[PDB]
Structure 1
Amino acid sequence: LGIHSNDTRDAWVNKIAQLNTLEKAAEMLKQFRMDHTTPFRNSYELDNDYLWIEAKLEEKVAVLKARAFNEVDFRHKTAFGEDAKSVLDGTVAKMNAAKDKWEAEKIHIGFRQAYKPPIMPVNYFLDGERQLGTRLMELRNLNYYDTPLEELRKQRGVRVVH
């Protein structure tokens, strides 16, 4: 146990140290982001350590991608070989086609989970942040207080424990 060093962090450092190919490392990072990083995460088991572990995994993936990609590829491709511009544009089209704030939020959070650097190049990813966030904020903050807290609770799907 420990706030800044503990056994969970050590085990994940050893697990990360055993990743040699950019493909496996990026897959592990994407899976980790699905499993442990969002309100929509699959588990809160790592809630105290996941940010640090994700930073370690990001370092490993970034190093591997720099080794494996060429200058143009490092600038313009995701760690999975996709074209970052196409991925960003498709996500933005989906976001602009979003009907309500619930779909918009799923789109934005999924984009962050799938393409957060070092998966997508930082320039493309922060451009996506700009546009998708504009759309999400416009959908969310419209008529912010109209919905009663009871209806809002039902819409969020929150179980009242007290």
Structure 2
Amino acid sequence: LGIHSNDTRDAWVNKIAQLNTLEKAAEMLKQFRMDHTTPFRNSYELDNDYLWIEAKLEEKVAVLKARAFNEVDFRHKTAFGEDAKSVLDGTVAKMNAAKDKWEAEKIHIGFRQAYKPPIMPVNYFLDGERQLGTRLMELRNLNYYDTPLEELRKQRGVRVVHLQSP
């Protein structure tokens, strides 16, 4: 009852099995990603199982989405009903408008949490990953070592618990 098979995982498989509405399933996924993924997760309580749980959710959302959407939409429409290309183009605009790396990072992370397939079509999603990632790196890698660690720690907003250097 640990690594690959455990009570918390069995619990979630039964939980997703209660889903039978693309809207419901799609909403739970988006919420799951908000609570348990990225350094901005609402908590680290599912740290050892969220990666696996997420995938199992995606499966339910994908199956429902294929049966609910028509060919045209499954290719150009998000699980929520948004127009993929619209979101993609919109997010990129904001990213290119980001004033700094701190702003850019927030845009990218958020995008992933909200539209990662089965929400947004893979073609549009990875296309965004391509444009968004480029801008994030451009801002982050400029004069990468200028800011001393003491200061960088403050910018990140981390709580320093211990430092030791002989």
Q: Assess same fold via TM > 0.5.
A: yes
The alignment-based identity, stated in percent, is: 100
Instruction: Give the C-alpha shift of residue 110 in structure 1.
Output: 0.1
SS in 1 for 2:130: helix
Instruction: Give the C-alpha shift of residue 116 in structure 1.
Output: 0.2
Summarize deviations over 1:95-142 as a string: whole Å, max 9, x none: 000000000000000000000000000000000000000000000010
SS in 2 for 1:93: helix
CA distance in 2, matches of 1:97, 1:64: 36
CA distance in 2, matches of 1:90, 1:143: 28
CA distance in 2, matches of 1:37, 1:7: 20
Summarize deviations over 1:43-74 as a string: whole Å, max 9, x none: 00000000000000000000000000000000
CA distance in 2, matches of 1:40, 1:20: 29
Which residue matches 2:65?
65
- Count of equivalent residues: 162
SS in 2 for 1:38: coil
CA distance in 1, matches of 2:60, 2:17: 8
Instruction: Give the C-alpha shift of residue 86 in structure 1.
Output: 0.1
- Root mean square deviation of aligned Cα: 0.4
TM-score (norm 2): 0.97
CA distance in 2, matches of 1:86, 1:43: 31
CA distance in 1, matches of 2:126, 2:71: 19
CA distance in 1, matches of 2:109, 2:101: 12
CA distance in 1, matches of 2:118, 2:145: 38
Which residue matches 1:8?
8
Q: How does 1:3-82 map to 2 (within 5 A)?
A: 3-82=3-82
Instruction: Give the C-alpha shift of residue 2 in structure 1.
Output: 1.1
Gaps of 5+ in 2: none
SS in 2 for 1:82: coil
Summarize deviations over 1:6-49 as a string: whole Å, max 9, x none: 00000000000000000000000000000001100000000000
- Structure 1 residue runs of 4 or more that deviate by more than 4 Å after TM superposition: none
SS in 1 for 2:42: coil
SS in 2 for 1:96: helix
TM-score (norm 1): 0.99
CA distance in 2, matches of 1:121, 1:149: 40
Instruction: Give the C-alpha shift of residue 161 in structure 1.
Output: 0.9
